[model samples]
Target: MTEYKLVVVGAGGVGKSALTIQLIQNHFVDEYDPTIEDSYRKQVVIDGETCLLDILDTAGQEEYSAMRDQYMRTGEGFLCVFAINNTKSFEDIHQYREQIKRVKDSDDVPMVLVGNKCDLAARTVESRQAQDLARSYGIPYIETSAKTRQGVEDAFYTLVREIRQH
Candidate 1:
């Protein structure tokens, strides 16, 4: 019935934009990536209802730190992403999660813990490790590979469903 503002947040090199581009454009962003911050829109059907997703692909670099609260203020849902092969990225999810809750001033905001780059076989962060964290947070966890287009749709759609269910 309305447009959902979804924000993708994570540490650098975690494929936040990759997942966003894959969802909206249906292609992997391989080289010459040009996003400090990018917004994408697409109308998709979820659970037999049409949902308009307004996705904010945020820069993982600290240079864009100042812009974080602006989007978090308006975002209806969040995809907190991390690469499975990078443990630092996974650990950094804690800060992003806390920041979102701080800005929104709510403990139960709509959110999903996204473990990206599942195509990589050399994973430093195991699936159970991430799943345990998600379980503790009381939110859904999904593994996605933006390069291979795996679980991309479910990651975003799950957040939308979370928003509706909230």
Candidate 2:
């Protein structure tokens, strides 16, 4: 039972929770309720390998800063998600990266830049711009849609595999 602590982070309404749900349970939430506090944890098995995924759906509100730091400190790997249709979420990657560095004290943390909401690419901010930013961070990037189950599994497994290899 090789366990790993993985964190998912991004701005509000970026589908962090939804992505977590889809990956762990293969389900989607159409109408999300944002009043929840703290993140949800779920156990998932990939290729008969048991791993505990601590899905940290931190509040987008600035008040939850401390909790976010706590989660980041224990994270072995991270998935920094941003909605493809929202540029602001993408821009917040730097803030997320900084927080991770401050808490984890490592720049070599295995991370995957996930662009959520690929189903609505017509309203995307800029795919290439997001890719360029991810490239600059030296992390792998993928476009995903929770509704379509597109890239949801890949996003998680890819990071897990990378971390295990390292």
Candidate 3:
């Protein structure tokens, strides 16, 4: 099976860990402190091909920024997430993407733009805005709700497909 190194990045409180946990453990974690750095792994079949996913859920707070570039250097694919209800979080997604590219020294890295917390009724970041950003970046965008487990697999799986194409 091929191994995919996937990195999850976003601003604080965007539910990056929640999404990763739902994907790997098949459950939702409603409460937790901000992650410094968390790693998880799972083996699954995508498109009838078995693959091992090595996921790194990184810190969103600014203090933990020191460690990001190190992991960014090793990641093969990235899920750049933002909470739809939080406009600041949505804005931070662009910086994360740029940081990843800077660390990798390449503009064509595999990545997916994820708008998390879709279960919320109110949204500060519009769907069209996110779609436009993804379009400009030439990457796919997916809305996900970790608590409800909506579009969780698609976010990670799409990143894997992006990696495969690279």
Candidate 4:
């Protein structure tokens, strides 16, 4: 199997789990209950290539601050997620980028800054700070709404494609 490790990181309550579980589909839906959610893995086909995605949902399994180093070091690519409504989450993503680069010992790493929770209005061009940060880092900025699945596919698919390119 073609394997790739993708980590999804954001502060708690940013909807990281909700976003991943949607893409994972319902095969494992009820790990018996929604409260005891499943942190799952997914396989996708892209351009006739089998892409095995290992999605690490790190925010809840353990606090991000303590687990960030371990999670960052192992993943091949990262989705630095944030809630558009939470400015701190947006502001905190830079440190994720910087830490991953430090762990990989490479300035260049495949990543995307995901501005999640777009059912709300801040999902618009108003998060100028995030847009500017993405521009500065030369990473793609995506606005995703887990509720409607907008740009969710694009976020994961684009990150996987970028990983393959590297």
Error of 2 at 126 (Å): 2.4
For model 2, residues 1-166, the per-residue Cα lDDT tens digits are: 5777788888888888788888777899887666234566667787788777666666666778887888788888898988888888888988988888879888878899999999994655677887898899888899899989999989988888878876
- Name model 1 segments beyond 4 Å from true: 32-34
CA lDDT of 20 in candidate 3?
Answer: 97
Model 1 TM-score is 0.96
List, residue by residue over 1-166, the lDDT tens digit for candidate 4.
9988888877666777777877887221223222222346777887788878888777533344556677678888888888988887787777778878988898879998999888877553356777888889888899887777888889988899889888
Where model 4 places Cα greater than 4 Å from the true spot, the runs are: 26-39, 60-64, 122-127
Question: Can you write out model 1's per-residue Cα lDDT over 1-166, one digit (the tens) per residue?
Answer: 6899999999988999899989999999887564688889888888889878999989887887778888888999999999999999999999999999999999999999999999999999999999999998899999999999999999998999998879
lDDT, model 4, position 97: 81
Question: Where does candidate 4 have its weakest 10-residue lDDT segment?
Answer: 27-36
TM-score of each: 0.96, 0.90, 0.98, 0.84
Model-by-model lDDT, in order? 0.92, 0.82, 0.93, 0.76
Clashes of each: 0, 0, 0, 0
Best by lDDT: 3
Regarding TM-score, does 1 or 2 come out ahead? 1
Cα-lDDT of candidate 2: 0.82
* Residue 109 displacement (Å), model 2: 0.8
Model 3 lowest lDDT segment of ten: 60-69
Put down candidate 3 lDDT per residue, 78-154, tens digits, no spaces: 99999999999989888999899999999999999999999999999999999999999999999999999999999
